Structure formats: C-alpha cells, structure tokens
Amino acid sequence: CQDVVQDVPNVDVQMLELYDRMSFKDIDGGVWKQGWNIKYDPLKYNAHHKLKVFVVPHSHNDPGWIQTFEEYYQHDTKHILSNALRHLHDNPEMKFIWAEISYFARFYHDLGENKKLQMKSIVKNGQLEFVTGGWVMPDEANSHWRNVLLQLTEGQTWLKQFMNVTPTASWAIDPFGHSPTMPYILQKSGFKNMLIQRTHYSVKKELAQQRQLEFLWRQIWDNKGDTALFTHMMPFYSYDIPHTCGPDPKVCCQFDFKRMGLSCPWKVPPRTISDQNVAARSDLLVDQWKKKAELYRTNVLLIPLGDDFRFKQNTEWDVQRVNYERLFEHINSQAHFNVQAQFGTLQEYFDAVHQAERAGQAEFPTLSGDFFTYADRSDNYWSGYYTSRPYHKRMDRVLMHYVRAAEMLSAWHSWDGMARIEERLEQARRELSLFQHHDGITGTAKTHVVVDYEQRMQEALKACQMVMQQSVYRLLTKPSIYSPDFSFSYFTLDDSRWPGSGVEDSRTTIILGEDILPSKHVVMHNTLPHWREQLVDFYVSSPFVSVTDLANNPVEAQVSPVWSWHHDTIHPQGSTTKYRIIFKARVPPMGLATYVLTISDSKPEHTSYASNLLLRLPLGQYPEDVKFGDPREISLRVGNGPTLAFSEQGLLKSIQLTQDSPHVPVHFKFLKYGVRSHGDRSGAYLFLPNGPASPVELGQPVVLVTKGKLESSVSVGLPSVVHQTIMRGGAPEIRNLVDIGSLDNTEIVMRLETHIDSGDIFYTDLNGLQFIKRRRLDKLPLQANYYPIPSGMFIEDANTRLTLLTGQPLGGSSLASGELEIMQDRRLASDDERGLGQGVLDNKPVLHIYRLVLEKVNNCVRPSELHPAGYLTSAAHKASQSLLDPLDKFIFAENEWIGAQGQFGGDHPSAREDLDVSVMRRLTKSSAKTQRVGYVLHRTNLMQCGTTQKLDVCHLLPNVARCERTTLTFLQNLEHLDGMVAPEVCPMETAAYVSSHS
C-alpha cells in the first residue's frame, strides 16, 4: 500500500497551488471574451501533418429541470431517440453519442422487437455510442460517492444486460464544477477517458495557455499515479455549437444549421452550404478548428455538435448532416486545408489521441485537485446550489442509507419472485439514481419537478421499508416457524431523524398496558461491518417502561418527555400521553439485536428519569415536575464525555474535553446574507451576497434544558431555527429545525467561532470520500470561498482541530482564522438567469443534523504542510458514520412474535474501523442455479494519534464456489481469486468482489 500521509505526489498542475498563483483577472479577450486572440502558424499543417477533426453530434437531455422526467420524455426525448434510430439506420456515416440511460431504458422497452434489433445494429456498428452510461449525468458537488457509483451501476448494468456494451469514455458537459471523485470511481469501473466542461473561465484560460486542457487526473494523495484517468477539459464558455467549433461564437453560430425559430445572438445567421459558398464557408470553419487545435497537444480535434434537447426533428437531422457533409466533402478533397474531417464518436476521438501519444507526438501533464467553485462569468460563482432545496438534499442521505440497508438485509437470502424484493429494490435504486441528476440534488429544478423528485424518493423509501421489515422477520424468526405473508407488515420502521417530529409528527407511539398489551419487541439493524453501541429511542404511552434483551437481562434506560415547539413567540409544549424511552443498543457487525419494552405499575429498577429546566407545563404521569428559571448560562456533562457550556440564549460557548483540560471557546452564532439591490441577483445556482453576513436578533428566546444519565440536550426556539445540542457522552449532535418562512432574499448561515489558529486554511470533503485542503483567497469574492460541504469540514492549528460532520450536503467556508460556517437555507425572489426562470420560494421546514468534534491533534501524524489532502480522526469518522448510517429501528407490528430470536450476525467479523462494506447486493434472482453477491469495500484513511478480525466477504455467505475482484459496477472480472479469499484493501482504496454460491 502507498503511504497517503508522509509522501506528497509530484504533479504538473496542483489546483490549490495553481489557485494561489492565479490572478483571476476578468480581461476582455476579444471574440473569445475570457481567453485571447489565438494565433497558429499555417505551415504547421501539410500533407504529412494533417488536422484530424471529429464532429460528434449529441443532445443534452435533462431527466428533470423545467419539466419532469416523463414530461420531457413525451415532449422531447422519445422524438430525439426515434429520429436517432431512423436517421442513423438510414445514414451509415452519421454518428451520435448518448449519456442518460434513464431516458434510453424508458424509450427502448417501448420499442417493437424489429426496432430493438435495428437499435442494436446501430450500437454494434458504432454509429450510436453510449458515453458514461450512467442513469443520469450526476451533480459532482452535493452527490455522495456511493450514489454516484449507484447511478453509474444502474445505467451500465442496463447497457450490459440489454445492449452488451460497457462505455469506457465519460461525458460530463453540464455539472456545475467537477470533482476528482468522478475519475476515482470511473478508473475503478474500467474507464480509460473522461470529458468535463464547467470549470472556472480563469482556469480554462490558464490551462489553455499551457495546453494543459488534457491531463492525467490523479487523486490528491496518489504518489504512484495508479488512480490517473485521461481527462479532456473543453476550452470555452458552453458545450453549445457557438462555443464548440472554435474561439469566436459569431463564426461558430453560423455552423449551427438549426438556427435557420432560433437565431444567432451575434446577428449573422447560418447559410445553407452551396457550391457557390462552400470554399469560403470551409475557410471560415477550418480557421476556427485550427485555432481550437492550438489549445491541445495532438493533431486530433474534438468538435462536439449539439445542444439542449437537439435532434428532435428529422429535418434538424437533415439540415445538420447534409450541410456538414458538403463541408467535409469540400475540405477533405482540397489539399490546401490539410484537414481530414468527419462525423465521429467520443471513443473515436480518445482512440486517435492515444494513437498520437503512443507515436511520441504528445506527452500529457499530470493533475490533482478539484474544479470548485465554478464561475461561468465575472463574479457569478455557483456556490448557491450547494444549499438550494436543503429538504431534498437531506432526503438524499436518508434514502441513500435505506437503499444500502434494504439491499444488505435482503441480500442474506434468495427470495421467491412472489415477494417482489427485486421490483422494490429496482424502483428504490432508480428514484435515488434519478435524484443524482445535476438538476435533482442541486435544487436547480422548477417547483413541480422538485415535487416529482420528492414523490419518487418517498415511494422509494416506502419500497426500502417493506424490503427491510420482510428481511428482518425472516432473519430473526426460527426457520421451523417462518411462514411469510409477503404482503404483510411484520415491523414498522421508527426514524427519529427523518423527517423529524418537528417537521412531521409521524413517529408511532408504542401503546402498552398490563391490561391491553404488556410488552413490545423492537429490533436494531447495524449496516456497518463492526460491533456498534448507539443510544436508540422509541415513543411509549407510559413513562414506567423497562428494557430487557430477549434473554431477559435488564438494560439501563432513560425516559424523557416528548417536546414540540409552537408560534402564536416560539415556546415548547410537552406531551401528557407519550414519552421517549432511551437505551444503548449493542448490535453485531452487519447484524440485528432484539430488545423488549415492558410496562410496570411504577418506576422500574433500571429506568432513570430526566429533569427538565425551562428558562424564560404538565407531563401526564412523567414522575419529575418541570423546573423553571430566568435565562442564565449552563454547563452539562454526560458520562465521561465532554463538558459543554451554553450562553443564556442556549448556544454553545465552550467545550472541555477532559476533567483536567481547558474550557476551549466554541461559539455557535446564526447570521444572515442578503441579495444585491443593483447588479447580479442570487438564485437557485448563484450566491451573490450583498456583503458579509449580519447577526440574527435572537431576542429573549425560551431555552429548554433536559438532563439525564444517558442523554441531555439544550434546545432554543430562535427566529427561523429550533436549535438543539444533544449530549450522549461523546461528540455532541446538533439539530436545526430550519423554517425560513417568508424571509424573502435571505440566506441563514450557522457559524462556529474559535481561537484555533487556522489562518486561511480549512478542509472540506468531496462526495463524502476525501477531505481536500482549501485556502481562503481575499483576492476572490466571498461566494468564491464557499465550497460544497457534502459530509464535513474542519479547521486546525498545531494543537487543536474542530470538525463539523453533516447529515446533508450544504454550502460552507472558513471566512476567517478559527471559523467554520455552513448555510441552512436560502429564499430568493429573483431568477439568476441560468434558464430556471424562477427564484427559490418553495422552502419547507427541514431538520439538519450534525456532529461537532473538538480534538487535540498535537500527538497526531498529520500530512506535510505541502500535502493537498486532510484526514479525519477515528472519532470524526465514527461521528460521520453515526449521521449517514445510523442503526435502523423496527417495532414488531403484531401483539405476539412466535419463533423470535434475539440476535443475527453474532458470528460476523468485526472489521478494522477504517473499513466499510459500502454495498452488499445479491446480483441473481431465485431462478439462477449459481447465486452471486456483490460487495463494495471502501477503506478510508484515519490519522494515527496513538491508539478486530479479518473480513473476507467471499466467505460471508455459505457454499462459496468462487470469488472475483470486479469493477465497482460488478460488470467485469479483474482478478480470479484461486483461494476464494478477498485480499484486504489499502487506505483510500475501494474494491468490489463478487462471490458465487452452489
């Protein structure tokens, strides 16, 4: 294994380093507004050194944006794919690339066998080429790497199954900035090349000037270069035809033949190509191509030809094909051009580029880093969509976990097709895959489309719950008794965090009575491959409840009241009819644990009761009366864990890690950003703040303090936010119920203030996979120092680190030494002129979840001050795991459960803490005679600060007949393991394995 901590990779372009030494001047470059007047030596070209031009037709299809998936399918996409099948069949020389397999599967399954075979013929002979072959073209900022791999797998599994093709070239023309997570996953999924477009105009100029627009993109920690993937960055402002022929859009627009009810903004229309004008038209176009070609190191030129939902009308196919063919015929026949031009595919471009490389014609630079935050012009930084529609951003992480749990729980067995496990899991995977779209999770779609995504994800959650509860009943019911009704609800799921009782009062109360129903079985699932102890809670009808395991061993518990917050002043009310029972569940690796909740007369031996302090109320049978008092400071400690001090407004002010350590200042504060009155308006995409954020007036808010042996919390009702700090004996958990209400042109930010001597350095993660060093640049505007916070952010000095872990992707920064900040929600009256044609006025209450880890790092082995990566501690990693993959809770639905067992997976290996089974998925239905199960293993890298059994997934299921290391999609064998043991994986590596069973 490589050391990813001590050694810094040597790369030609390191983006943090490049950023430091770039000026980012927005100079008028001429016809190429953000570049320069490109010049080439015409004697560069001759009969032995021709320019080879591939013109690659394409159609950018959004699976939701202005219209829903189905609306676009019926209005646009089904016509584009009908016409592609017809025109390509009829015209053997015509080419077309297709990215979105969600639309292609929708279309293909509706074809007659004749058309299906015709479709197969144009794929087989390379006329229609799939690029990436993901379900969608995903967002790269907010997306979790697990969901990027899921949507890739869903698209490529469809292509392999129905078209017997696996793309090895990626096409990502529209995501709003680019992540090195994409090459990481692509290169471990068999890919050889990828293409990107939306990178900062100053980065385009800078790389273009050095012909570094093609590069071997490696991971920021990769010393060896084994992660390297060949990347083509397109050089200009758009993927549209005016911005793809060459540097001058006024010329390129004349070669978009559909613009004869569309026109050219530069007011020179395209002209039909004739024998009268082909010599002149060809001279104009080839001059553009030769300028584009000066930006690249080979004599092979990519000329994309398309735009949004193009190639819809058969006459657009005619007018583009016939005019380009007249140009190609003229140019190829005229030796003075020294060009060979033709319709081509993306793979054809890359193949030719690598042929040129192998022949010594070019050697390509190496690059590490990311391409956030994107600006398409001036100060228009796209950091807005890191936060837009945060409700659905949170929903993404919930559904991610439920799909993982449902696939893992159901994987243990083969299921009868009558159970419809495969149908439910396929629905769940596709709704979540669809939401990865760059107008889904981004929050950049119209309100009615956001509603479609929400309803799709809600059906997906329901599908996962049905699979999970059937699976748990099977895993924990004696095989001699197990006799399932596949339509029956054996368990209901209990989720304290989604949507959140403050968002929807939906959690079921377990109603117990010595009369009516004395006891209830509950079951916890642990998707992680190690023993886990976590506090769990349930709603109960009485406070006099005792916890046992199934062996009747008592379990210490705490009962708290059920609190909710109300307006008219924001104040808490307490239930008289339901209570929280809280206890520590101990659950095996990838396993289940059964407990029993039992009512009594009065206070049981092993259940404690929390005190309640209301600073500024009956609780039925709750045996401790609520104490009252004036606003004042408070200090709480749970177990041996940290001591937290709170202001008289119920906001953290300091953390003491240990009894004999200092009171470290850590202040939470809420602030607000506004919208510019004059010039560019913030919208779904753009963050254009009218200066630094302003404190929110908190007034005299009501602070609720609940104190118990197992769990304590401070809650305050602030304007727009019910803020809560929960303590369970480690890093505290922060919950914000965010209701931005009617606060038009407002962004609400949560800031932490410390004396940590961070300076201009902070760390943010990419797709929950890796932490990247950021440097705050005063030469860039505020919105440019905003980065994606998909799962966490941290600041540190020589001695101290503060890490904030998130349960949802949000936008954030460190805008000053010792600060972190993270946006909670945004309400924007104005459109930001990127085509959505509305503001963001559909806000709804969302419960945001966080863990806050203050740590001493002076005895941690940290990377060199030159390393572009950071790494979490054990504590911060486990805290992230708590948020993303908590224990699942199941309440047995019926009065009695015959055959009930107490534990599943007691014999499962407890793997090293830095190892995860990201995916466990059964690949075969019951009717297959060799059953197959896919595993994705990810090993992170944790900082060694000076403090388990081997996991072989090949042997997790019995009767293993063989085991293959595969691509992450499971679609190709990479290494036969004669041994049928999976070798363990290196730090920051991800490997896939498929086990076969007889």
Ligand X SMILES: OC[C@H]1[C@H](O)[C@H](O)[C@H](O)CN1CCOCc1ccccc1
The closest of 772, 818, 816 to 793, measured between CA atoms, is 772
* 62 binds ligand X per the rule CB under 6 A: yes
* 174 binds Zn ion per the rule CB under 5 A: yes
Is the CB of residue 561 less than 8 Å from the CB of residue 622?
yes
Burial label for 333, CB within 10 Å (0-12, 13-18, 19+), is exposed
* 733: partner contacted, choices Zn ion, ligand X, none (Cβ within 5-8 A by kind): none
Is the CB of residue 826 less than 8 Å from the CB of residue 746?
yes
Give me the residues paired with residue 96 across strands.
Answer: 128
* 174 binds ligand X per the rule CB under 6 A: yes
How many Cβ atoms sit within 10 Å of the Cβ of residue 166?
Answer: 18
- What gap in Å lies between CA 280 and CA 284, rounded to an integer? 6
Which residues lie closer than 8 Å to 935 by C-beta, 6 or more apart? Answer: 917, 919, 920, 953, 956, 982, 992, 993, 994, 995
Nearer residue to ligand X within complex by CB, 418 or 451: 451
Q: Which stretch binds Zn ion (CB under 5 A): 54-62, 113-121, 267-275, 626-634?
A: 54-62
Q: Which stretch binds ligand X (CB under 6 A): 438-446, 514-522, 675-683, 988-996?
A: 438-446
State the minimum distance, in angstroms, from the CB of residue 177 to ligand X: 12
* 77 binds ligand X per the rule CB under 6 A: no
Q: Which helix (H) or strand (E) holds 69?
A: helix 69-72
Angle at 896 between CA 893 and CA 898, to 5 degrees: 115
Q: Buried b / exposed e across 290-308, counting CB within 10 Å, b at 16+?
A: bbbbebbbbbbbbbbbbbe
Within positions 835 to 864, which residues make up the interface with ligand X, using CB under 6 A?
835
* 835: partner contacted, choices Zn ion, ligand X, none (Cβ within 5-8 A by kind): ligand X
Within positions 727 to 786, which residues make up the interface with ligand X, using CB under 6 A?
none
Nearer residue to Zn ion within complex by CB, 222 or 307: 307
Among candidate residues 20, 28, 139, 174, the one labeled active-site is 174
Q: State residue 464 phi and psi, 5-degree precision.
A: -55, -45
How many Cβ atoms sit within 10 Å of the Cβ of residue 601?
Answer: 7
Binding string, residues 899-938; x marks residues near ligand X by CB under 6 A: ----------------------------------------
Residue 438 labeled ligand binder:
yes
State the minimum distance, in angstroms, from the CB of residue 175 to ligand X: 9
Residue 765 labeled ligand binder:
no
Q: Which stretch binds ligand X (CB under 6 A): 270-278, 395-403, 436-444, 939-947?
A: 436-444
* 834 binds ligand X per the rule CB under 6 A: yes
State the minimum distance, in angstroms, from the CB of residue 373 to ligand X: 15
Give me the residues paired with residue 53 across strands.
Answer: 301, 341
Nearer residue to ligand X within complex by CB, 138 or 561: 138
Angle at 845 between CA 842 and CA 847, to 5 degrees: 135
* 204: partner contacted, choices ligand X, Zn ion, none (Cβ within 5-8 A by kind): none
Nearer residue to ligand X within complex by CB, 438 or 877: 438
Binding string, residues 780-819; x marks residues near ligand X by CB under 6 A: ----------------------------------------
Nearer residue to ligand X within complex by CB, 439 or 819: 439
- What gap in Å lies between CA 859 and CA 846, rounded to an integer? 39
State the minimum distance, in angstroms, from the CB of residue 436 to ligand X: 13
The closest of 852, 824, 809, 802 to 750, measured between CA atoms, is 824
* 444: partner contacted, choices Zn ion, ligand X, none (Cβ within 5-8 A by kind): ligand X
Q: Which stretch binds ligand X (CB under 6 A): 44-52, 437-445, 848-856, 879-887?
A: 437-445
* 495: partner contacted, choices Zn ion, ligand X, none (Cβ within 5-8 A by kind): none
State the minimum distance, in angstroms, from the CB of residue 592 to ligand X: 42
The closest of 638, 632, 640, 634 to 652, measured between CA atoms, is 634
* 308: partner contacted, choices ligand X, Zn ion, none (Cβ within 5-8 A by kind): ligand X
State the minimum distance, in angstroms, from the CB of residue 318 to ligand X: 25
Give me the residues paired with residue 138 across strands.
Answer: 437
* 444 binds ligand X per the rule CB under 6 A: yes
- What gap in Å lies between CA 138 and CA 135, rounded to an integer? 9
State the minimum distance, in angstroms, from the CB of residue 238 to Zn ion: 12
Binding string, residues 304-333; x marks residues near ligand X by CB under 6 A: ----x-------------------------
Nearer residue to ligand X within complex by CB, 62 or 537: 62
Handedness of CA 72, 76, 80, 82 (dihedral sign): positive
State the minimum distance, in angstroms, from the CB of residue 834 to ligand X: 4
Nearer residue to ligand X within complex by CB, 174 or 765: 174
Q: Which helix (H) or strand (E) holds 118?
A: helix 113-124
Give the CA dihedral 18, 22, 28, 30, nearest 10 degrees: -40
Which residues lie closer than 8 Å to 861 by C-beta, 6 or more apart? Answer: 5, 6, 943, 944, 945
- The string of DSSP letters for 185-230 reads HHHTTT--EEEE----HHHHHHHHHTT-SEEEE--TT-SS-TT-EE
Strands in 51-60's sheet, in edge-to-edge order, are 300-308, 51-60, 339-343
- Residues touching ligand X, count (CB under 6 A): 10
**Near ligand X by CB under 6 A: residue from 65, 72, 104, 498:** 65
Nearer residue to ligand X within complex by CB, 775 or 834: 834
* 831 binds ligand X per the rule CB under 6 A: no
Is the CB of residue 853 less than 8 Å from the CB of residue 770?
no
- Say whether 174 is catalytic: yes
Measured at CB, which residue is nearest to ligand X? 834
* 803: partner contacted, choices Zn ion, ligand X, none (Cβ within 5-8 A by kind): none
State the minimum distance, in angstroms, from the CB of residue 944 to Zn ion: 43
* 888 binds Zn ion per the rule CB under 5 A: no
Nearer residue to ligand X within complex by CB, 5 or 252: 252
State the minimum distance, in angstroms, from the CB of residue 588 to Zn ion: 44
Is the CB of residue 157 less than 8 Å from the CB of residue 430?
no
Give me the residues paired with residue 713 across strands.
Answer: 706, 726
State the minimum distance, in angstroms, from the CB of residue 60 to Zn ion: 6
- The string of DSSP letters for 604-642 reads -TTEEE-EEEEE----TT-SSPPEEE-S--EEEE-TTS-
How many Cβ atoms sit within 10 Å of the Cβ of residue 856?
Answer: 15
Residue 678 labeled ligand binder:
no
3-state secondary structure of 160: helix
Nearer residue to Zn ion within complex by CB, 384 or 500: 384
* 214 binds Zn ion per the rule CB under 5 A: no
**Near ligand X by CB under 6 A: residue from 52, 58, 60, 424:** 60
Residue 90 labeled ligand binder:
no
SS (H, E, C) 652-713: EEEEECCCCCCCEECEEEEEEECECCCCCCCCCCCCCECCCCEECCCCCCCEEEEECCCCEE
Q: Which stretch binds ligand X (CB under 6 A): 57-65, 354-362, 388-396, 792-800?
A: 57-65
Nearer residue to Zn ion within complex by CB, 307 or 431: 307
The closest of 294, 175, 204 to 24, measured between CA atoms, is 204
**One-letter amino acid of 113:** E
Within positions 568 to 587, which residues make up the interface with Zn ion, using CB under 5 A?
none
* 62 binds Zn ion per the rule CB under 5 A: yes
- What gap in Å lies between CA 237 and CA 259, rounded to an integer? 19
- Residues touching Zn ion, count (CB under 5 A): 2
Binding site for ligand X (CB under 6 A): 60, 62, 65, 174, 308, 438-439, 444, 834-835
Catalytic residues: 174
Residues that bind Zn ion (CB under 5 A): 62, 174
Annotated binding site for Zn(2+): 60, 62, 174, 438
User: Which residues are known binding-site members?
Assistant: 60, 62, 174, 438
